Amino acid sequence: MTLGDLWKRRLNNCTKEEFFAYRRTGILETERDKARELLRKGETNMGLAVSRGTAKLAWLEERGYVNLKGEVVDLGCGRGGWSYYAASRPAVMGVKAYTIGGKGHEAPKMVTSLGWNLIKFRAGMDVFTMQPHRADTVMCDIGESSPDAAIEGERTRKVILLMEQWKNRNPSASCVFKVLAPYRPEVIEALHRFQLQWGGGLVRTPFSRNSTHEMYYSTAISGNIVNSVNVQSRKLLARFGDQRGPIRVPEMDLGVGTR
């Protein structure tokens, strides 16, 4: 059993009030009150982020931890926060975005955020059985949270396998992907194999709630995986009991228009 496994157990042991206080303590949280209502009312002329994913990917890019360029694929795009972010980047030439949709899953949000015309959305697509194609940048933000850490580990393992499939098709592609449960043993093993062949490393974004152990893998960074994970597990365990609130920051606004 790992420190991350214990983090999951203590998280599940929280009351509802404890859970709500814990998940937000010390995290950056974008102010979405305006964006939420524009989406609710059916407004399409908006560059405010369609989800909390936009600021996460923007932080990775702005830190230089990811390179978004060329033909981008967004595997598991959901509402599209990463697809709209990539499409707004001048170095990006096109985005092909895929998501399963269906009951209890987000469909793409359709807005005029800058470069929307360069995104081709496909809902109803399972990326785990879809053949890879040419891409310069491969993005994947899949990993559905569960109270069962073993299920989270298996979900994470499937994402890593998918990224190996896309690297087999595109050995030179930049890759950025969510690792939902980095502490599970089959995940560490899979990340070690990925890093051995393709380089890269893990990083925690400051927008990630303490209720998820998610870390992002990118081929553009480095670092010992086991140490990266254990540092993060210890930090999450130490935050149980902190009552400080989140740090509220403005939401990303990418502007609107075609590219």
Ligand X SMILES: Nc1ncnc2c1ncn2[C@@H]1O[C@H](CSCC[C@H](N)C(=O)O)[C@@H](O)[C@H]1O
Instruction: Mark out the alpha helices in 110-257 (DSSP H runs).
Output: 149-169, 185-198, 225-238
Question: Which of 206, 204, 210 minimizes the C-alpha distance to 241?
Answer: 210
Residue 128 sits in the site that holds ligand X (CB under 6 A): yes
In the bound complex, what is the minimum distance in angstroms from residue 209's beta carbon to ligand X?
Answer: 14
Q: How far is the CB of 79 from ligand X (least distance, A)?
A: 4
Sheet arrangement for strand 215-218: 119-123, 92-99, 70-75, 137-140, 174-179, 215-218, 201-203
47 binds ligand X (CB under 6 A): no
In DSSP notation, 19-50 reads: HHHHHHTT-EEEE-HHHHHHHHHT--S--B-S
> Is residue 76 close enough to count as binding ligand X by CB under 6 A?
yes
* Least separation in angstroms between CB 168 and ligand X: 18
Those residues whose C-beta lies under 8 Å from the C-beta of residue 105, and which sit 6 or more positions away, are 78, 99
Residue 123 per-residue DSSP state = E
**Which is closer to ligand X, CB of 75 or CB of 190?**
75
Instruction: Determine, following the binding rule CB under 6 A, whether residue 142 of this chain makes contact with ligand X.
Output: yes
Task: State the residue number with the nearest CB to ligand X.
Answer: 53
Nearer to ligand X, 125 or 226 (CB): 125
- Residue from 53, 115, 132, 201 that binds ligand X (CB under 6 A)? 53
According to the binding rule CB under 6 A, does residue 51 interact with ligand X?
Answer: yes
Q: Which residues bind ligand X (CB under 6 A)?
A: 51, 53-54, 76-82, 98-100, 105-106, 125-128, 141-142
